[PDB]
Structures are given as structure tokens and as C-alpha cells.
Amino acid sequence: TPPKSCSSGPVYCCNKTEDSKHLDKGTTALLGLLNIKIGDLKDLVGLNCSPLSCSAQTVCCTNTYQHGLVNVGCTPINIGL
């Protein structure tokens, strides 16, 4: 068996995360641009995310858009000791 963490998807390293209930206007605007419905989102929104070393936020996300411009359905994950 290989090591496993996220139930769905790779671990992501996201430069920034925000609570999907308290997104700033630029983040909100960017998600509308991408046609993402805010009211159907849960947990965190990640910005500028790369699948996995991470000096920013390591998160599990259900979806990633535009090469990691925006992730959604993100929750923190600890893959250390």
C-alpha cells in the first residue's frame, strides 16, 4: 500500500486559502468569472495551488480549475509526522 492522505485527489500546496463563507471581492469575482456558484461551495477556496514540500497551505480539494488558479472544496491536511 502507498501512503495516503486525501480521500480524493493529490495533496495541494496553495499560496492562499480563504473560508468559502468569507471570500474577498477579488476572489468572489474570480470565481464568478469561472462560473463557480459560491452558495454551493463548502470549506476553503484555494488560490494558486499546485499538487504535491510546501511553505504555504497544504490542503485536500475536490476540484482545481485553470491549472490551480482556483481550487474549491479545500480542507487542511497534515502530511508530516
Numbering used by the authors: 11 to 62, 71 to 99
Extract from the study:
Hydrophobins are small proteins that are secreted by fungi, accumulate at interfaces, modify surface hydrophobicity, and self-assemble into large amyloid-like structures. The amino acid sequence and molecular structure of hydrophobins are diverse but there are some characteristic features, including eight cysteine residues that form four conserved disulphide bonds that are separated by three loops (L1–L3, also referred to as the C3–C4, C4–C5, and C7–C8 intercysteine loops). Class I hydrophobins assemble into extremely stable amyloid-like structures called rodlets that resist denaturation by detergent, heat, and acid. To provide insight into the assembly process, we determined the first crystal structure of a class I hydrophobin, SC16.
After optimizing initial conditions, SC16 crystallized as a cluster of plates over 1–2 weeks. Virtually indistinguishable atomic-resolution structures were determined for two crystals of SC16 that existed in two different space groups: C2221 and P21212. An α-helix was present in L1 from 50Lys-59Leu. Residues near the N-terminus and L2 (C2221: 79Val-85Asn, P21212: 78Ser-85Asn) did not have interpretable electron density, consistent with these regions being flexible. EPPIC detected a large intermolecular interface that was present in both SC16 crystals and had a surface area of 607 Å2 and 589 Å2 for the C2221 and P21212 space groups, respectively. This surface involves both the N- and C-termini of SC16 interacting with L1, L2, and the β-barrel of a second symmetry-related SC16 molecule, with 44Thr, 72Leu, 89Ala, and 110Ile being flagged by EPPIC as participating in close contacts. In particular, the N-terminal tail adopts an extended structure from 27Gly-32Ser with partial β-strand character that associates with the β1 strand over residues 42Asn-46Asp of a symmetry related SC16 molecule. Although the buried surface area (~ 600 Å2) is smaller than the 800 Å2 expected for a definitive biological contact, it is larger than a typical crystal contact, involves a very small protein, and is found in two different space groups. Repeating units of this interface also result in a linear association of SC16 monomers that suggests a possible assembly pattern within rodlets. We found that although the N-terminal tail of SC16 associates with neighbouring molecules in the crystalline state, it is dynamic in solution and does not significantly influence the self-assembly rate or morphology of SC16 rodlets.
